[PDB]
Symmetry: C3
Subunit: 130 residues, 3 copies
């Protein structure tokens, strides 16, 4: 489904903050006792609207809210950390949750290079005829 | 292993309640501020004992308790939400956790349709003989 | 990467404690009301330094701390239980997260036994010639 920004405005640039899971620690800075305080663990970056990604992203987050709110309504977990892990699992189950019928539309198996390994090796049983 | 109900009685019908992860929201009902209170988020349904599923299910839950209690004894999590996700992961690891030896018993790869794509395409190298 | 113990000493034996997820319960011992208290749920064992595993293990845990501390710094979860599950998911995504190109280096599909099922069944179309 296409994402069409339907907001009164779009800030086309995204000045973001995040954390780094394992920033190349400098010396002992990784030791909690010596390291940064809560305020100083953030990195920043600036992204522009190439391919319209920023305006699309603002619209996507907006459109995500209904399903996210409904998901939160139905869970009894107080804080939910597992959405991305569950999506990773669902990505795998959609592809590998059943028998992979080769050359079927729902089987992500490419036998290309290797059909050329047997059809190319027929001239070792037909052309080798003596 | 077969499930054999060994209870003094069986209620053969299951009047159930659950939640819907993303019920087709009507208007603004999905907004927590406007939506139902805790008591009003439930859907209901009624299932009968076709194939003996209800009596089997009551027995299954009964038999599950020992292993579930022992699992809970050994975890330090206060509330456990991850059992089904872990079972999904284990489903995948059992099938795809090693090398898939095609036509082996533990490899869920069907090369059927496509063995008929090469054995059917031999008459393009043997019957085409000129 | 090789693990080289660089500690002042190594205790070469590991007297360990753990829990058993589902110990073969004896009678009603699995019922929380009747079962062991927190102190009595542990099993023990003793492992020696065969293959240098114990000294390697002490070094591995030591070397793991930087990345583990940095991971903990960047999470907002108060208690983290999901590291091993996430590693299991990542194990699967590395192998099955894309299209599996058979006989490619990142495709864990063995067509061995079964290339001998078609190359062995050529003498049913070539040697059967009449
Ligand atoms: C995702 O993006 C959507 C588009 O920006 C957001 O839609 C907003 O939704 C709220 C309600 O949830 C609307 O607020 C209502 O506004 C009406 C009318 O407001 C004035 O404007 C009309 C002309 O449209 C005018 O004729 C009226 O007389 C009002 O003066 C109020 O009557 C309601 O009580 C209510 O306040 C927003 O207007 C609406 N925005 C737009 C641009 O349509 C949506 O909220 C976003 N989702 C999230 C989760 O943020
Ligand atoms: C799963 O289903 C099982 C089958 O319904 C449940 O088994 C129940 O287990 C409890 C103990 O955990 C038993 O309670 C005991 O009962 C005996 C005897 O009770 C009376 O009956 C005998 C005849 O059988 C009679 O001769 C006696 O004199 C008694 O008058 C008591 O002595 C014990 O102290 C204890 O209370 C249940 O009897 C038993 N039910 C059945 C139908 O066997 C099991 O509990 C279920 N699991 C869960 C987790 O719910
Ligand atoms: C993983 O294993 C590593 C190797 O065992 C551990 O390395 C330890 O790291 C701490 C700091 O994080 C060091 O403590 C420092 O020690 C120096 C010097 O101590 C004395 O020794 C030198 C000779 O090396 C001597 O010349 C000095 O005058 C000192 O008398 C202090 O100056 C610092 O203030 C600080 O205390 C350990 O020395 C170091 N151990 C070794 C064997 O190198 C590492 O800690 C382990 N990681 C975890 C998470 O446990
Ligand atoms: C469906 S994946 C997707 C969707 C939208 C955008 C992008 C990727 N990326 C990078 C992701 C970015 C997202 C926000 C947090 C920091 N990270 C790096 C980007 C790169 C350059 C300009 C704009 C954008 S927006
Ligand atoms: C091993 S999967 C399994 C095992 C037992 C039953 C069923 C599936 N289903 C539907 C599942 C049902 C379970 C309870 C919560 C609501 N959902 C829909 C069923 C359908 C119709 C009559 C009886 C049953 S019992
Ligand atoms: C990369 S997997 C790995 C790495 C190091 C060791 C081992 C496996 N095993 C068994 C695992 C053991 C680990 C500690 C908790 C209890 N369990 C059984 C072992 C067997 C016998 C002697 C030494 C060792 S150390």
């Amino acid at each position: 489904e296409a994402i069409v920004n339907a907001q009164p405005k779009c800030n086309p640039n995204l000045h973001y903050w995040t954390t780094q899971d394992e920033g190349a620690a400098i010396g002992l800075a990784w030791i909690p006792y010596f390291g940064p305080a809560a305020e100083g663990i953030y990195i920043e970056g600036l992204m522009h609207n190439q391919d319209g990604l920023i305006c699309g992203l603002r619209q996507l987050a907006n459109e995500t809210t209904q399903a996210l709110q409904l998901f939160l309504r139905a869970t009894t977990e107080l804080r939910t950390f597992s959405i991305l892990n569950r999506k990773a699992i669902d990505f795998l189950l959609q592809r590998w949750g059943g028998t992979c019928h080769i050359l079927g539309p729902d089987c992500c198996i490419e036998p290309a290079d290797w059909t050329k390994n047997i059809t190319d090796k027929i001239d070792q049983i037909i052309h080798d005829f003596v």
